Design brief:
The complex is a heterotetramer, with two copies of chain A and two copies of chain B. Chain B is of the alpha+beta class. Chain B has helices at about 25-30, 70-85, 100-105, 120, 150-155, 165-175, 190-200, 205-215; strands spanning about 5-10, 40, 50-60, 60-70, 110-115, 130-135, 145-150. Chain B contains eight helices and seven strands, in the order E-H-E-E-E-H-H-E-H-E-E-H-H-H-H. Classes of the chains: B alpha+beta. It is classed as hydrolase/hydrolase inhibitor.
């Protein structure tokens, strides 16, 4: 999945 | 001689302008607390594991993180930087000199979570919601300044936003963690990569003003080793 | 091919304040110009020689320095930093990408003279002008560097330097074959440099002072300056 | 001699 860094 | 870090990785009261950074308190409750260790890294860079989270907790004010910085190579480096740095080495009002805490407050004052995109938090997420916590020059979420210390109780006690009851709960957990069982962090990054990030940090618009406001947003009590 | 630096190490028409920093234009005339090459170092660390001054000149606006950045080891480090620096890699308005120039402007935007204490300007116990350092921010106002591959272009960025003065400066710069300069003694003290970069981020009002300095120096766009 | 750095 896509992670948001923060 | 343990080195602990504490701080918010999200403060609920802040207005969030970018939808991708929003963490709904009513949704994250299903995924907290996280008590298994998550890596603590630097600036989301590879090869920069420096320690482990001890707990990620939902509290009334936001999401609060505790961690231990345990990498011998990283601590040795930080100590050497502290010996050369002017800012790390200056007097701290009302507190005894702690060069290592001071350099970490100059270099990496911010905390930043890596977490799954919040479109996925509404659903049944495809992997772990919370991935890692990074130490950084300045967080993208407001109020996310670290407090570093050698006494966990003192670290958590600095956040007036965290209730006497919430602190007790948090430290009950932190106390039950045996630091000696944790694995050795993978800290092998070239120093040039870190120095490039440190250089970039100096051009972050209004960085020092935002560090000062973040201290207020987090409700941190003086005295502390924070540099803004 | 060559990599030049130019800029003021002192601007005459800045308010003076710290007595130890004052360079009396009536007094330096006897020691200028300096045409013997002086070391260029990083942040006054003597084992970080990166190149050599090509001239230190008294002009109407102040004391102007030209130099060549020649150390292979240093340029290799600068290039490595440019590879991952976001500020170094960002486009510059109206100019093509120049990675080495852009990293230099990001890391070391300032010039700083080292010279003999003003009290010790007697009829001195060491040389008057010792070296010039590249730094995060100068103690003297208006001392931002311009880095370039074309020395005429670098000097021409300073609208404070007259056509006449520029011709003179470049006549001298042209007479210096870079290939003839000795290899600088550069030994990277990487932890020391990182400590300095960390400290530079905590200099209050640094980006405001860099912006102001560009005006004090009268630098003309376009240029690779990052503030 | 003492130099003034900067």
């Amino acid at each position: 999945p896509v992670y948001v860094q923060x | 001689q343990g080195l602990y870090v504490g701080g918010f990785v999200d403060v609920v009261s802040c207005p969030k302008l970018e939808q991708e950074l929003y963490l709904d308190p009513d949704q994250v409750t299903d995924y907290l607390p996280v008590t298994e260790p998550l890596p603590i890294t630097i600036e989301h860079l590879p090869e920069t594991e420096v320690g482990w989270t001890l707990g990620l907790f939902q509290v009334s004010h936001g999401i609060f993180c505790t961690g231990a910085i345990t990498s011998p190579a990283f601590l040795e480096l930080a100590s050497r930087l502290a010996d050369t740095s002017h800012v790390a080495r200056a007097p701290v009002k009302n507190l005894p000199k702690e060069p290592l805490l001071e350099i970490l407050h100059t270099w990496l004052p911010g905390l930043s979570l890596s977490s799954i995109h919040p479109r996925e938090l509404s659903q049944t997420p495809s992997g772990p919601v919370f991935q890692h916590v990074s130490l950084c020059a300045l967080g993208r979420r407001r109020g996310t300044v670290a407090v570093y210390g050698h006494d966990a109780e003192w670290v958590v006690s600095r956040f007036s936003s965290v209730s006497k009851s919430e602190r007790a709960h948090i430290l009950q957990h932190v106390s039950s963690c045996r630091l000696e069982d944790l694995s050795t962090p993978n800290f092998v990054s070239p120093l040039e990569t870190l120095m490039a990030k440190a250089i970039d940090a100096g051009f972050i618009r209004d960085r020092l003003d935002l560090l000062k406001t973040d201290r207020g947003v987090a409700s941190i009590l003086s005295p502390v080793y924070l540099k803004a």
